[PDB]
Each structure stands twice: as C-alpha cells, then as structure tokens.
C-alpha cells in the first residue's frame, strides 16, 4: 500500500498448505507496480468477511462482494500503471485471476495461462461515472473457456483484435415525416420482422410486443433478426471444424427502468432453443449513466442466433417510453453487437462489403431523390406524352437513367 | 525442455567460430519462457539431419523441413506464454529469426532488428486443425524486406494495424431466382469483367475461363478486377515518394482439389507484367479444413494490380464445382484480400466511404423495392393515365419520389 515504482522480478507467490487468503497479492494506492514473470499458484479463496469462495456459490459472490478487496489471485485497487506479463498460473480456487477496481485506469495485461480460476480470467470492477478507463488485454484471454466480464470488455481498447461488429445502428440526424424529434431510428431498415409503433409519430420508435419468457418462440410480430453460424460441409468432422462464435457482447443505452427487453437466443439445427437470455434497460450500466455492455455465452452446437427487442409485460409498448424512459438519460439511441470469434478468422469475419476497384463501393452510389412530380390528368393524347417525357428526363438527370 | 516460469534476462547467445547449430536457443514443452533484451547473433544454420541452410536451397528447406525442430535463431515448440521484447539481432544465416510450432498459441513478439535472416522474420509452423492460435507481432516486422509467412499473418490478432481490406465479399443469405441453394454469390456486382456461369442455376457461381499461365494477358471474358497504386505527381522524385503496397495477403476457402485458380498480377505503367502468381484450392490450407491465406510480393515499380478467378484447364468451369468441390468443405464462400502498406497511411488507406454528418452514409438509403405493376394495355386514353398515376404513387411511396 502507498508505494511507487515497484518491480517484482521473478520469484514466486503461492498458498501451499491451504491457508485462508483473500488473494495472493493485494495492491492498493500504488503508482506503477510491474510484475515480470512471477510464479503464481495454489490459492484457497475467501472474501474479506471470511466467506469461502467455492463453485456452488460463485454467482452469489459476484453479486454481493463486487466492491470487496478480495476474490482474485492478484487484486489491484487505485493503481496507476499496473502491468503483468505472461507467467504460468495454476490451481486458482477463487473467482478470477486479476481483479481491477477503484479507478485503476491504464492497466496492461499480458497473456498468462487462461482458464485457471472459477469464473473469469480478468474481472474488472471499476464503477464510477467520472473515471475514464482504457486497458490493453492479450487477445487469447478473451476467447477462452472463461473469458472476461462485460466491464473489462467495455474498457479494452484493443477489442477489435478479437471481435467484429455484427450489428451497428444509430439514429438519423433529420427526422422523417411525421415526427416530433430525431432521438431514435425512424424506419425498420435494419430489421427483418416487426413494425414501427405508430405511423403518426415515428419518434416513438420500434414496436415492442409481449413475450412471456426469454426462451419462448419468436413470431413475425416481434422485432428480431436471425443469422446462421458454423456452416461446414459434409467432408468435415465437427471435432475438426469447431465452433464459429464463442461470446457475444451487446452494448446499448442506459435507462433507470422499463418493461422493454433486449433478447438473444441460440438455437440448434432443428429450431429448438439451446440457450437464451434477455436484459432490462438498467442492465446496461457498465458505463453509467450513458451506455453499457452485457455478455451472452454461445453454447456449443448452436446453428442459428436470433436477437431483437420485446416487451416483458402484457401490452404493446414503444422503444421510446418502455426502453429509453422518455429520453431522460440519452438523446441518441444506438446499438452495437460484437461477436468474439472462437478462432480469429477461421470462418471469415463479418463486415461490410468493399472493393477498391469498384466505384459503387469505393465512392458510393451517386443517385439522388427525384423532385415530386404531381399526378397528371391530361387526356387529349399528348399531355400524357409530355408527362412521360418529364419523368424520363428526371430519371436520366437523377442517376437512375 | 519441460520447464516453467523461465526468465532469461540480458546475457548473450552467439555462434562465434562457426559451429554447426540448428538454432541458437531451442525451447520445447515449457510454460512461460520470457526473454528480456538478450543479445542474439552469428548463427551458422543446419537442419537436424545435418543439411546446410544456404540461400541456394532456401525454398527447398521450407518445403521439406517445415516440421523439423530447426531453422531459426530461436525455435519454440509447444510453449505456452512465449515472449521476446526487442533486442538487436544480426548475422543470422539460417531461414528465419523466430520459428513457432507445435501448438504455441499465445505468443507475443516485440520489435527486434528486422531483415537479418534469409527468408522471414517470423516463421509460423503451427499446423493442427484443433489448435486455436492467437499471437501479437510488432507491426514493423510485417512491412519489412522479408516480412512474415502466410501462417503467421493468419494467426496475428493485430493484423489491422498494418493492413486494410481491399476486397471483402461473402455469400448472400436468401438465394436469387433461379437457384438451388445460397452457398455462393449470385451476382457479379463486385466484379468489373466476366460473367456468371449459368443463368438457370445461379448457385453454380462465377464462370471460370481458360488461361494458359499466370503471366498471360487477361481479357474481358475472364473474371477479374484492376486498380492503380502509387500515384505521385510530376514534382515528386520517386526516391522520395516510395512504394504504396508491399505484401498482399489473400484468404479464401479450402477445398481438396480443383482446376480453378485465384490469380494476381502486378503490372508496370505500360501494361507489361512485372510479376504474377496463381493459387490452387488446396493452397488455402493454413487453417485447414475451412480457409487459408497466401502471400504475394509486390515488386518495386508496380503501377497496376489485377486479381481474379480463372481456370487452369482448357474448358469453361464454375466456381462451385471447380474451386469449392461441390461444397464438400464449406457451405459459405468468402474472399478477403489484405493490403500491407509500405509506409502506414502515407498514401491514405483504402476503406469504405463514410460521413457522420450525411444521413445517406450514417444510416443508409431508405428506398425499398417497388411492388410489381403488371404491364397494361388500356387504350381509351385514360387507362394509360391511371397506370401512370399508379407508377408515380409507387415511386413516391417507395422513396424514389
């Protein structure tokens, strides 16, 4: 506690003999603590109170002891310039390997042995609105059997080394007629199913239909999308082909309450639901009070994924007033979904099409909206011809040709 | 061999006196081997058999001794957590500087002195279908006179720090009429020349036309694209302007056989071919059995690049049955081409156009396909006008206005 420019080179920290430890090393209020290849092993984990950390109660621990200085092989609190390279770590019977908290904001984490703790590899618990965290995490810790929590992925500046966006959407600048604002999407361009809530005020957003639970079948009335994953041929064995997507991180805007829900489902080849989850507006709070992330675990053997927005109470709701709370926290809606690939680009990452040699993709399409031509009633056999000539002239001038 | 948490700090490893060495250091079956600034120099390379590694036979070595524990200044085999920072290295007369093999899967490589070996800087020889490798390589080793092999670029998680995509294409979800499936592109939109194989089953893919060798001229019958590089003006000397692109990396899907070829050509100002190559379906096997990468070396003084698909045997082929082998390995075709820039963003990287302030690029075009209006034969001088009014109404409603 209270040190600066500390180097721990080589050496070892181990709990041989099963003593009761909150952590192997606890670091608080230091500036630049650096660990070079130290050997870490054999912890028998407890919380600061004295509660044992086992598998059976692991989830309980993560809810009730988030702010505790405990729960990891190395606990880091209020440390500037933390850094650990890639040592061998094993036999970790606590919740995580590294825990970060209390405005530890420029850390850097090398690739140590993955999947040794009980729940995560890196557990980030930084939680104050005025902090600006930005860390660097080795990519092989993220696509592993345990991975990192949603807040660590929020704060990981190099997140595009393991993932790509499979959905990116934001609201327009200029509202469409008719509307009273431009805080949400005004069309259903990004979605295969569902509808807009109301055609007289498009600024109410999407329509949210009732669904009793997150594992129920979705219908064409609901707002949702579907895509298929891990499509290998008949001459490939599944033991060799592997799984295409390991985790999915969803980011969207925060609100203090609401009955609307973001829902995600992983389904097998014959339509059956393998796993599923939904999330409420106040779950999206890793970067309170604006936005946040949540994590979905894709089970092995999934063939399709469905994602969307629904209503958890029995009536037809609106994105504006049942997910965004009347824009009390955010004035611009956005939705980004990141796919973490099981193996970097084995199946080819998803991203927008492009070609440096094709002008349609290199610069875009130069067509413009045509000026409004009034419907014509001229019946002397040439007013119709003049209108046709006007329409053809507009088509030629506006790019459609 | 068989160690864990090994640190080699400072020091030196050198072959002064020309002893016969397979490597300077050999590491096998270790966990966390870390090298901090060690001085490596002067190796006289041999293989494990006893074959001298010279320039004259270098290519032969890379084919026949890929699985040998030899051929580099540092050879790493089955090591977790390998790490080397940036020491000075010189006089490396063997194939590569670092060689990685046998499921070394979370490595990290700093920027040591580039271009000291005979063929590569980093040589990745990991080759098992069930491994998931993900490494971090300093960017300055990739755009150097030797660079890294295709497999290392495959496994390099930070590959978007040195390159950008100049072609990215994948197959649609819903097939177009008429087709028997949706495993390949159904349109020729991304391509300037060539045609689809058949108009009665679009799921046969592109048409592949005959080409006798990869250095022959391409015609408008062949499926190919062209773009120009390194466009400096009259007041710039070429010794100052330099070269825009250096190593071009292509991945696409694997298949066990086929006569189709992916072809690439670098051409000088007056249309002449400076260099060229083509690749078979089974060349794309760095991530067997799904996809893989190959590398093309752009010669200095190139002014244009052409890339595309052709047939190496004298008859007209199809992408489905002569490059993808009837979808025996992949159900989803894709093609990504990565340009490694000679000097970062000096000439401006290529990527799709965008503007946060323009709604056409911020959210997309809201136009929708019009409902089918049947051809009309009404000749009393007003049925034609009713049809025109219907067409104008559809145009106004569908966004064209």
From TrEMBL, chains A, B:
It is found in: Virion. This is Depolymerase.
């Amino acid at each position: 506690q209270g040190l600066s420019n500390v180097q721990y080179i080589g050496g070892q920290l181990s709990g041989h003999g099963s003593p009761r430890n909150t952590s192997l090393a606890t670091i608080t209020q230091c500036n630049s603590f650096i660990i070079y290849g130290t050997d870490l092993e054999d912890i028998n984990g407890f919380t600061t109170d004295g509660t044992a950390i086992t598998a059976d109660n692991i989830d309980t621990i993560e809810s009730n002891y988030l702010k505790d200085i405990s729960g990891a092989a190395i606990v880091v609190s209020s440390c500037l310039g933390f850094k650990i390279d890639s040592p061998h770590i094993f036999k970790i019977k606590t919740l995580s390997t590294i825990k970060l908290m209390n405005n530890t904001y420029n850390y850097e984490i090398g690739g140590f042995t993955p999947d040794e703790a009980l729940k995560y590899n890196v557990w980030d618990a930084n939680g104050l609105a005025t902090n600006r965290i930005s860390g660097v995490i080795h990519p092989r810790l993220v696509n592993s059997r345990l991975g990192i929590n949603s807040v660590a992925f929020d704060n990981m500046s190099n997140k595009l080394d393991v993932s790509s966006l499979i959905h990116n959407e934001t609201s327009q600048i200029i509202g469409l007629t008719p509307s009273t604002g431009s805080n949400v999407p005004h069309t259903r361009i990004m979605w295969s199913n569902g509808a807009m809530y109301s055609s007289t005020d498009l600024n109410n957003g999407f329509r949210l239909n009732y669904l009793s639970n997150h594992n129920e079948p979705l219908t064409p009335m609901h707002l949702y999308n579907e895509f298929s994953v891990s499509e290998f041929g008949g001459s490939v064995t599944e033991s060799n082909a592997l799984d295409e997507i390991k985790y999915i991180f969803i980011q969207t805007t925060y609100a203090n309450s609401g009955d609307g829900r973001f829902i995600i489902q992983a389904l097998d080849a014959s339509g059956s639901v393998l796993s599923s989850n939904w999330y409420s507006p106040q779950s999206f709070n890793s970067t309170f009070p604006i936005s946040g992330f949540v994590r979905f675990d894709v089970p092995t053997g999934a063939k399709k994924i469905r994602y969307g927005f629904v209503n958890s109470a029995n009536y037809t709701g609106s994105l504006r007033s049942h997910f965004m709370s009347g824009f009390a926290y955010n004035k611009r809606f956005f939705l980004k979904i990141y796919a973490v690939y099981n193996d970097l680009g084995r199946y080819g990452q998803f991203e927008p099409p492009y070609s440096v040699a094709i002008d349609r993709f290199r610069v875009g399409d130069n067509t413009t909206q045509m000026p409004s031509i009034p419907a014509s009633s001229a019946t002397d056999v040439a007013g119709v011809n003049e209108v046709i000539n006007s329409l053809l002239a507009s088509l030629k001038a506006n790019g459609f040709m």
